[PDB]
Ligand code: HEM
């Protein structure tokens with residue numbers, strides 16, 4: 301599993317961290333990563349795992365590298381292996397103004413999900429709420445029928461969690477097979493939904509091609525799935541384990557957006573990277589062309605150099621700082637929609653199921669990867685203390 305130490309890596313910089321299976325996984329995935337942020341670890345280290353790659357362990361380095369796109373390419377952001385124009389278009393379809401308009405329907409969606417659970421006194425929140433939410437949101441956002449969810453959720457599940465029935469290419473191809481006819485059909489048309497708007501979008505002074513539309517539509521679908529699913533889960537895990545914070549938000553529901561932000565820092569989950577386009581000396585380390593560098597979005601907000609008592613969750617935290625949504629020219633297009641889903645989920649949950657907790661004897665498991673997450677989250681609660689609220 302350890303790749304041979306390349307000629308240019310000095311030994312004092314070798315810290316073999318497996319981003320797919322960290323040593324302290326059972327303490328929590330963020331805690332497992334924050335081992336890179338111990339006093340004795342350099343700001344920039346080399347791991348021999350996963351082919352051999354760099355890791356920036358600090359907020360300064362992470363931010364700087366995502367700003368320095370000329371040295372640090374997004375051609376290969378995954379370990380192991382006019383953009384502004386495409387972003388402007390995507391932002392037409394998920395920007396704040398679209399999110400603002402949809403809030404109402406996002407809230408209806410959330411409420412019937414929680415309502416269909418509320419009387420149970422128990423659920424697997426990850427499977428029962430968190431999974432079916434962001435996919436349904438995308439259907440809403442994209443004027444797609446609910447009946448299309450089972451086949452569509454299957455394809456996206458194959459890209460990140462294959463059962464072996466489809467290779468990534470096959471699943472990719474089938475997603476496109478599904479999208480193309482809708483794009484071509486709505487291109488002809490003044491539809492106000494997200495596919496229509498992407499379909500009919502202009503790029504480089506010409507119209508977007510069908511191949512380009514299906515590609516952006518594809519990333520909008522898949523980028524807003526596992527991230528949200530897992531982030532919601534970390535958040536609910538925390539609240540389940542912490543009644544004081546649960547009551548804090550019950551007593552002051554206007555604090556919820558600041559909590560969201562604090563939880564985004566504390567339960568950050570994405571770890572992407574870049575590839576060096578040429579040799580480059582960076583913070584006193586010789587990087588070599590072709591080197592891949594992990595630049596863990598997760599780490600910035602957990603760096604004590606950026607937030608005091610980084611592992612402590614405080615909703616009154618004065619200067620919340622994090623790159624949970626990335627940094628630089630690829631900063632998440634879906635962050636606004638994500639925030640809304642987070643806030644809406646918490647408000648609509650808490651005002652319905654104020655008291656709840658982890659099933660007794662169950663131990664929550666985390667997994668670690670590009671998008672870290674939660675295996676399962678069993679909750680229990682007494683239905684007598686819940687309530688119903690309709691829209
Ligand atoms: C809490 C949930 C989310 C987190 C933590 C998050 C995290 C991010 C991060 C860190 C990046 C940049 C990766 C890089 O620089 O290589 C990003 C990019 C992106 N995300 Fe988000 N994401 C979230 C939700 C969303 C949602 C809701 C959507 C779409 C609806 C979205 C779609 C995108 C797309 C299309 C990109 C690529 C932007 C570009 O390449 O220019 N993700 N995601």
Ligand SMILES: CC1(C)[C@@H]2CC[C@@]1(C)C(=O)C2
Pocket residue numbers: 522523524527570572670671
């Ligand atoms: C890691 C991601 C899920 C996040 C959104 C899509 C994705 C593959 C990225 O490029 C950033």
